Design a binder for this molecule. Structure first.
Ligand SMILES: O=c1[nH]c(=O)n(COCCO)cc1Cc1ccccc1
Ligand SMILES: O=c1[nH]c(=O)n(COCCO)cc1Cc1ccccc1
Lengths: 293, 293
């Protein structure tokens, strides 16, 4: 029905291709054999979260592997980790726009080389909330920039280029339905601001550098809230800009680890934080199992 | 004798500080005892390279423990890895400005809490060459942007802020003298262009997306070269800006994996690429040995 597509005429003309940061090559690896059956891709910053994710899905799907292991498909490199259980692939992306951008360029080409179709991609992550209790799960409506607009900007051969951000509306509704059925945590739908710096780029007072006042950053966070922003993270704008352009249905599901209107460091005890950290995995693995049921 | 400094008044008012992405805190770790002897810090993208680096410099210094693991000081998290031997720290930083930015805010705080002084910090890494033979090591003179200027722009509370990039001129000279004495590979001094992204951000033709022609990327690379740029990477601009601000003497030493005027993928056999990858490590460990003897 809907094949993954690239927006690059040069790919067709290449004899072989190397997915440098995955250590996978079309000369050595049989892409349709390895990945042709992939229907769900889940991505997140931490390699150990992504392995925890695949194990969670394994057990949900009863495709479980009880007493046994999920090999890292990227063994041989440590730029990203990658795991697979049935039609589900789990991929780490590190932190920040450039780190996920590289992963996405290589992932989208793998999916294309695998002859994948009807792929859903969901980012699971963590975030700072604005005016939400800690632990709230946010399903992103729009991924927005530091002016609270639905855009991703980058420089390409010296020229400022802008792409619109786009997340599948129907997917947001499907995820919300799952969350209501689960009833295990508060879930809200709102806008997610994506920044390039975690400290000064998100109005923190605890960096090595801070050129502004508590009152300054508070006015900034309030202005974000008024424009519909509910959480803050570092990957969502390029993720939304790229995935739509390539024929993938995409969502972003992040848990808030603190309320930024009240401060900058996490004051949840360790057991409570571990619980928050598995909420996006819980929702998404539940959602996948539903789809495969 | 120059202590590490912070540009943030709020730090003195905090009772404790958690370096979230290192899994270290000031209440649970005696930073002066643990890190107080640090005089050199080497940073790079890959944790496995940074572990290889510490093993290398440990042997140079006569501190090597045949049959002992170097422990990861950041055990408990997988955001970054960190290793130590005597007065040398090795820290991974992942890929891109945001990822290294997080690491540098926390590292500079750590060095401050440890009461370190006269610290030298050197980034080792890989790069795309412009008009250099593959495997050439570039000691960066100025870290430049896509206009080819020695500036780093960031958004702070929705506002553009421009900072100067400053790499220590004396340290460049010392690394150049070291390279001439070692005489194990071609070493040049030149400018290094720092881009946000890797595929379209560096004019490659092999991404999932590509908006320009081979001719247009070639012209842009030629304009970079005419402006003094000899290599291209993804972290030098923010590294230079932050380190100079906080009183660390900083330098960047990268190896070129290809010449981008010839194309975008590595023609080098993998055994050769493996020798190239070890060259910045070789130079900097040698430099540290000289400095400490
Ligand atoms: O405020 C945040 N902002 C943010 O971009 N994230 C993004 O996930 C980034 C890696 O920690 C996560 C948080 C929550 C947080 C708060 C304090 C310490 C660590 C993480
Ligand atoms: O062209 C480059 N540009 C670039 O920013 N780097 C930076 O180190 C980046 C992580 O892959 C490394 C290179 C060398 C290279 C070339 C082809 C494939 C992989 C790496």
């Amino acid at each position: 029905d809907c094949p993954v597509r690239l927006l690059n005429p040069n790919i067709a003309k290449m004899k072989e291709d190397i997915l440098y940061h995955f250590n996978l090559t079309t000369s050595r690896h049989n892409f349709p054999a390895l990945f042709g059956d992939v229907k769900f891709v889940c991505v997140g910053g931490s390699p150990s979260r992504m392995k925890a994710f695949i194990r969670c899905v394994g057990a949900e799907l009863g495709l479980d592997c009880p007493g046994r292991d999920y090999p890292n498909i990227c063994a041989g490199t440590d730029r990203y980790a990658m795991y697979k259980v049935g039609p589900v692939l789990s991929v780490s992306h590190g932190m920040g726009i450039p780190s996920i951008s590289i992963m996405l360029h290589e992932l989208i080409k793998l999916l294309y080389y695998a002859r994948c179709s009807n792929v859903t991609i969901i980012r699971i992550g963590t975030s700072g909330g604005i005016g939400l209790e800690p632990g709230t799960v946010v399903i992103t409506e729009q991924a927005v920039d530091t002016c609270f607009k639905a855009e991703f900007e980058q420089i390409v051969l010296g020229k400022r280029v802008i792409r619109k951000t786009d997340l599948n509306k129907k997917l947001v509704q499907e995820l919300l339905l799952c969350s209501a059925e689960l009833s295990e945590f508060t879930t809200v739908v709102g806008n997610t601001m994506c920044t390039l710096d975690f400290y000064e780029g998100q109005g923190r007072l605890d960096g090595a550098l801070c050129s502004y006042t508590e009152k300054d950053k508070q006015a900034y966070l309030e202005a974000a809230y008024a424009a519909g922003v509910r959480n803050i993270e570092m990957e969502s704008s390029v993720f939304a800009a790229m995935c739509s352009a390539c024929g993938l249905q995409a969502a972003v599901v992040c848990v808030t680890l603190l309320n930024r209107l009240e401060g900058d460091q996490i004051s949840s005890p360790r057991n409570v934080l571990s619980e928050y950290q598995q909420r996006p995995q819980r929702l998404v693995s539940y959602f996948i199992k539903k789809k495969l049921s």
